[PDB]
Amino acid sequence: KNKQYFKRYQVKFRRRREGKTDYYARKRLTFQDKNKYNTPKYRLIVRLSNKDITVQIAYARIEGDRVVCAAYSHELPKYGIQVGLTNYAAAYCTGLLVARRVLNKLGLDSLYAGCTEVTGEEFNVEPVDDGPGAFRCFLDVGLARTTTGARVFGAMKGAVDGGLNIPHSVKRFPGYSAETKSFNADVHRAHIFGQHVADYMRSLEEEDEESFKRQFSRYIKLGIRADDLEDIYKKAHQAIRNDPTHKVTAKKSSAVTKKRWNAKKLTNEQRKTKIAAHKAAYVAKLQSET
C-alpha cells in the first residue's frame, strides 16, 4: 500500500515471518540465569513433519544454537522398523535413540541405563550416587499444540527411557484420561509398542477389506502384518540400545562446486545492455508506425 507505510514498515524477525519460532517461548526456553554465567542448558527439540521426526539437543549460544545430538526417523530402517515412520510408537524409538546416542559419547551409559522394562508408568531417574545426577534436557515443542497424546510427547518418554532427566507430568501422555487423572500406563504401553495402529489394521479387515489398498498400503508391499508390530518395536528397543553411532557419512569431498550451477544473477553491465536494445528496438517498432 503505496510508498508511505513501507517507509514506516517494521518487519517481524525472520522466522516469525515464516512460522518457525515463537520468540515468546524461545525467550523463555533459552533462559539461563546471570549468576550461572555461561552454563548451557541443552533443551530437547522434537519437531515432527509428514514423514520424519527430528529430535535434537541444542544449547543457546549467540552466533547460533549448537546441536550436540541429532537422531532422525529416516534411519530406523537400520533398527527393524521399515514403515510408519511418524507413529506415536516410532517416536519413542527416536526419543530413545537420541538419549543413547548422547550417553555413550558422554560416557554416561554405564550408569543411567534407563527403562528397558517398558511399561508406560511415570519414570523419573534417581541420581546415581558418587556424584550428582544425569544429563538434563528440557522439552522444546515449538507451537505444536500440546494436547494429550501428541507424538511430541512421544519423544519425551522415549528420551527419558534412555535415562535423561527431563521434567515430567503424565498429563499429556496418551492414555491418561481427563476425569480424573486417573493414571493408566497400559494405553501408554499400547501406544508405545504400536498396538492401536495394529488394532486399526486388525479392525479394517472387518469393516472395509478393500481399504487395505488405501490406508495401510506398503504394509501389503513389505509384508508387515498386524500381529508383528508389538514384537517389531520390542526387538527394536534393544537394537537401538546397542548401536547408537550417530550415522556419520564421508563422501570426501563433494559439497562445494557441484558442479555446474553457480547461478549468476545479471551483472549490471548486462542489465544496462538489456535496456539498451529494449529501448532501441521499441522505437524501431514505433518506426513501424510510419
Partner: protein, 158 residues
Amino acid sequence: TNSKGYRRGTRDMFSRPFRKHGVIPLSTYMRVFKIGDIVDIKGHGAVQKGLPYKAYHGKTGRIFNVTQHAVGVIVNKRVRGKILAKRVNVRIEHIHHSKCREDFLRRVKENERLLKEAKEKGQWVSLKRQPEQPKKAHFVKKLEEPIALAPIPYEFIA
C-alpha cells in the same frame, strides 16, 4: 515547578528508535556479566521492569553484583558538588558492555607482543601513545598539470 516524579521528561529517553520496536532480540539475555565489568546504561522503554531512573541513563558503571535477572552496577552521580558512587540494581536489558576499555586491552596485548620481539633489537620499544605531532618537512611535487588552477573569491549575485 516540577521534575518529580519518576519517568518525567523521559518521553524521549525511554522511547524506542524508529522501526526498532517490538520483540527484543534474543542475544540481550545471552550476554555474560562478571563482577567488575564496565557497563553502560541505556534504558529500554519496552521493558518496564527494572528500568534505571533517569539520572543514570547515559552513564557508565562497573558491575559489582550479579543476580538471576539483574546486575548491580556502581555508577557515579554528581550530586552537587561532589561525586557519590551510586549502587543501582538494574535489569539486564537496560545494560550494555562498554567498548571503551577493550580497545585499551588490545594495547596491553601489544605492549607485550612488541616488547617480546624487542629482546632482539632492544630499543625503542616505543610503548607510549604519542599525540599528533606536527607534520614533517616534505617535498610536495606538482606534475600535476602545472598550477593556476587559481581561485578568486566570487559568489554573490542573485
